[PDB]
């Protein structure tokens, strides 16, 4: 956000000292449309209203790539990125581009099926792996039609190779769906506008859909939105009656955290300190973004205790008694039954546009109280 | 345009609120902030016209 | 006249203020006819005032279009009979759009679309009178749905308003956002 | 910015084009001759458009397909004009009436007549080229039986006094053409 000179009040706290804010001088000719991001955080990509492409490195702060509009097709319905962030994909309505950034070359171009002008949604899925020496990808292509494409895309430095594999054709138009890759296995969630929550899952060659059990007590509800943590492979599920936190694979409903009714297209979750001790996937703290349904104030409920007060036995890796002997510093921390999680209120004006941190630890955001001309 | 922007924060770990002013003289940007997306656990990027705000704390990025 | 110059000035400022109120409030012909009579016989702002009338009032386009084309058939007669034209691209695009909008409102939209398709839209600059803004805005809106069957104009014209505003928002930032969004669905076409 | 080879190509083309317009008046004309012209005209010049406007008028079934290029060249001559216009009265009138003619040949009638009735016919100066004449002749022809009906505000009278002063320069041929123009004056006075 350029200005002839930005300024902020001089800090009196180390709490604000490390707190910082910087521009990237590089820019689109015109205002932003939509963007996507690598899990590595090192990579970033962006597109404007002029639909120029730009990609940039976060830590090394050096230019990576730029593309003017006239280098590009008139239609650009969609965009997608590999989890590594080492490569880029774009969906013009008739044909997709696949380009490297770290090694700018035309890795591939390929025509693909479409049913305009139904809204797109898209998901990358890493293969048996071997980067950089050899690679593969599984291109999910979710559609408002409820069709869900999936494609093979083995790729090597020699030049990207491509072949189609399957066409899911799910019932009914869809609200939402998302990829969820457990380190053990690929899984993919699929909410319906019907409110059905199917999940395809990759048992290697097997690609099995399964009917997750939203249970009888509130089946009728229009959903707000499901959201989960794919690294946790855990399914949170919005309802005004109380969100689900359903288990995957072996699959079960667990518990429903007590909540105020919440606006649609708002729900999301974040957690501090990823780790995978003793097969368990505990985290230090959990937090909960959503706009409110009525008051429409931004809301971020917190749970967990910490810094040493608690450890989160979210789920259990095996819902069974266990006695494996390796060091468990968390055992020194107090066990958390759902009862003591105790949400921490902090209702705030909608006018302050803001987001919860991905670890959920911190709030951040801004708004313009006022602005004026050069005069 | 000159712009009296309002930075602020509220830590959950500290249960604590603070804020900062953010002047923007002669900005050509007109748009409201968003869509937003955290660029890390400690840092976030946000749309502001064609330009993108980047903010962080304790970040190695700075 | 040396006077009619100053009368043309006041009618100028009185029109630039009347066009910006046409976005927040519902405005009525009585305010325009005040500007027209306040103006002089054959001045500069007398032509722009009639354009405003042709744009801001669809219920009065046929009678209005006549008054515009008569004031232009008049400006021309007293140019040769007393002879080279002085038009810039922004005022070309201004008359261009204002006609197509006036002809969509007259049912010939079977033609008015194909005319709107070939409009050369200026770039981003400081020069942008509120007359040309109101026309470019109300023409973008009146052609945001019909034009999809080229489609470049809606997106280019919406970008002109978004990046070619120059006046304070007033239930208009939501309207400019509506322009950008309609342009987005145009991108989504 | 034109070399020295294409300037002569344009002069040669402009004389052949003028020749084809006046020849089209007392002989039967075709496009086969215009293809040779436009190709002979250098690739980005005023003579292109004059060759096109002649093709628009002289070939009426090809109106739809020759109007395409007339707009293409003008939208392209505008394209580089920024990446200020200065048009002449007779240039406006020529394009004005030539579009009116092209629209009637399409099936607009109403739209064709109203544009025709708002044509601003130039007074009577030296700006008389066989193209401007050929257009005004054929446009007077295809419109005199339509705009002559409603009576009140028309240019039919002004248009015919233009073609009067048109025919009469260096053609020096061939009496019967002048006799035909006399038949035109007879057509106007008897109207």
From Swiss-Prot, chain B:
Q: Under which name does UniProt file this protein?
A: Sterol regulatory element-binding protein cleavage-activating protein
Judging by the UniProt lineage, the source's domain of life is: Eukaryota
**To which protein family does this belong?**
Belongs to the WD repeat SCAP family.
Q: Which residues form a coiled coil?
A: none
Q: Which subcellular locations apply to this protein?
A: Endoplasmic reticulum membrane; Golgi apparatus membrane
Q: What is the effect of changing residue 32 to K?
A: In Scp1-M5; reduced interaction with sre1
| Primary role | Escort protein required for sre1 processing at low sterol as well as oxygen levels. May regulate export of the scp1/sre1 complex from the ER at low sterol or oxygen levels. 4-methyl sterols bound to scp1 may mask an ER export signal in scp1 leading to retention of the complex in the ER.
The subunit field of the Swiss-Prot or TrEMBL record says: Forms a tight complex with scp1, composed of 4 copies of scp1 and 4 copies of sre1.
**What is the covered span of the full protein?**
992 to 1053 of 1086
Mutant lacking the gene: phenotype: Cells show absence of mature sre1 as well as inability to grow in the absence of oxygen.
Q: Which gene encodes it?
A: scp1
UniProtKB/Swiss-Prot annotation, chain D:
Q: What induces it?
A: Proteolytic processing to mature form is induced by low oxygen or sterols. The processed form binds to its own promoter to promote positive feedback regulation and ensure maximal activation.
Briefly explain the null phenotype.
Cells fail to grow in the absence of oxygen or sterols.
Where does the protein end up? Endoplasmic reticulum membrane
Q: How is it modified after translation?
A: In low oxygen or sterol conditions, undergoes proteolytic cleavage by rhomboid-type protease rbd2 and is released as soluble transcription factor from the membrane. Processed form is phosphorylated.
- What is known about its subunit structure? Forms a tight complex with scp1, composed of 4 copies of scp1 and 4 copies of sre1, which protects sre1 precursor from degradation by the proteasome.
Write down what this protein is called: Sterol regulatory element-binding protein 1
Give the organism, scientific name. Answer: Schizosaccharomyces pombe (strain 972 / ATCC 24843)
Q: What is the taxonomic lineage of the source species?
A: Eukaryota, Fungi, Dikarya, Ascomycota, Taphrinomycotina
Give the encoding gene's name: sre1
Shown portion of the complete protein runs from: 692 to 889 of 900
């Amino acid at each position: 956000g350029w200005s002839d000179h930005d300024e902020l009040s001089t800090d009196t706290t180390l709490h604000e000292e490390k707190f910082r804010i910087e521009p990237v001088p590089v820019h689109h000719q015109l205002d932003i449309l939509k963007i996507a991001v690598s899990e590595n955080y090192k990579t970033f990509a962006s597109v404007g209203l002029d639909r120029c492409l730009v990609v940039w490195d976060l830590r090394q702060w050096c230019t990576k790539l730029v593309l003017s509009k006239e280098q590009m097709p008139r239609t650009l319905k969609a965009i997608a990125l590999d989890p590594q962030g080492n490569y880029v994909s774009l969906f013009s309505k008739d044909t997709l581009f696949i380009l490297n950034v770290e090694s700018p070359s035309l890795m591939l171009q390929h025509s693909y099926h479409c049913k305009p002008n139904s809204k797109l949604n898209v998901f990358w899925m890493p293969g048996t792996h071997k980067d950089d020496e050899w690679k593969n990808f599984e291109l999910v292509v979710v559609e408002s039609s409820g069709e869900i494409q999936v494609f093979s895309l083995t790729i090597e430095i020699e030049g990207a190779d491509i072949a189609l594999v399957e066409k899911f054709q799910l019932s009914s138009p869809i609200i939402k769906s998302i990829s969820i890759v457990s380190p053990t296995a690929n899984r993919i969630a699929c909410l319906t506008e019907s409110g059905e929550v199917t999940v395809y899952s990759k048992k290697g060659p097997v690609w099995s859909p399964k009917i997750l059990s939203q249970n009888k007590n509130y089946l009728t509800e229009t959903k707000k939105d499901i959201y989960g943590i794919a690294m946790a492979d855990i399914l949170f599920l919005a309802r005004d009656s109380g969100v689900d936190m359903i288990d995957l694979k072996n699959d079960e409903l667990l518990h429903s955290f007590t909540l105020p009714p919440i606006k649609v297209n708002t729900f999301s979750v974040g957690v501090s300190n990823s780790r995978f001790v003793n097969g368990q996937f505990r985290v230090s703290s959990i937090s909960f973004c959503f706009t409110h349904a009525v008051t429409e104030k931004v809301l971020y409920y917190y749970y967990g205790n910490e810094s040493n007060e608690s450890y989160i036995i979210l789920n259990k890796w095996d819902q069974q008694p266990n006695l494996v002997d390796v060091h468990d510093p968390d055992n020194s921390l107090a066990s958390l039954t759902f009862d003591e999680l105790q949400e921490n209120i902090h209702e705030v004006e909608d006018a302050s546009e803001s987001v919860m941190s991905s670890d959920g630890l911190y709030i951040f955001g801004m708004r313009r109280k006022s602005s004026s001309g050069i005069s | 345009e000159t712009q009296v922007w309002e930075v602020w924060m509220y830590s959950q770990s500290e249960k604590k609120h603070r804020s900062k002013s953010l002047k923007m003289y002669n900005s050509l940007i007109i748009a409201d902030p968003g869509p937003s997306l955290a660029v890390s656990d400690r840092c976030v990027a946000i749309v502001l016209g064609n330009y993108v705000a980047l903010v962080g704390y304790g970040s190695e990025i700075f | 006249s040396p006077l009619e110059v100053l009368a043309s000035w006041y009618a100028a400022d009185l029109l630039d203020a009347l066009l910006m109120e046409s976005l927040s409030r519902k405005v009525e012909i009585s305010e325009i006819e005040e500007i027209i009579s306040l103006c002089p016989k054959n001045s500069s702002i007398i032509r722009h005032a009639l354009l405003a009338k042709l744009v801001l009032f669809p219920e009065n386009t046929a009678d209005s279009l006549n008054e515009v084309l008569a004031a232009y058939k008049n400006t021309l007669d007293l140019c040769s009979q007393d002879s080279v034209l002085k038009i810039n691209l922004s005022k070309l695009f201004t008359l261009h759009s204002c006609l197509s909008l006036a002809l969509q409102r007259l049912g010939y939209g079977d033609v008015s679309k194909r005319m709107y398709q070939e409009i050369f839209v200026p770039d981003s600059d400081a020069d942008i009178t509120p007359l040309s803004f109101i026309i470019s805005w109300t023409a973008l809106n009146t052609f945001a749905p019909i034009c999809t069957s080229e489609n470049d104009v809606v997106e280019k014209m919406a970008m002109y308003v978004r990046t070619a505003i120059g006046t304070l928002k007033i239930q208009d930032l939501k309207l400019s956002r509506k322009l950008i969004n309609s342009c987005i669905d145009i991108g989504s076409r």
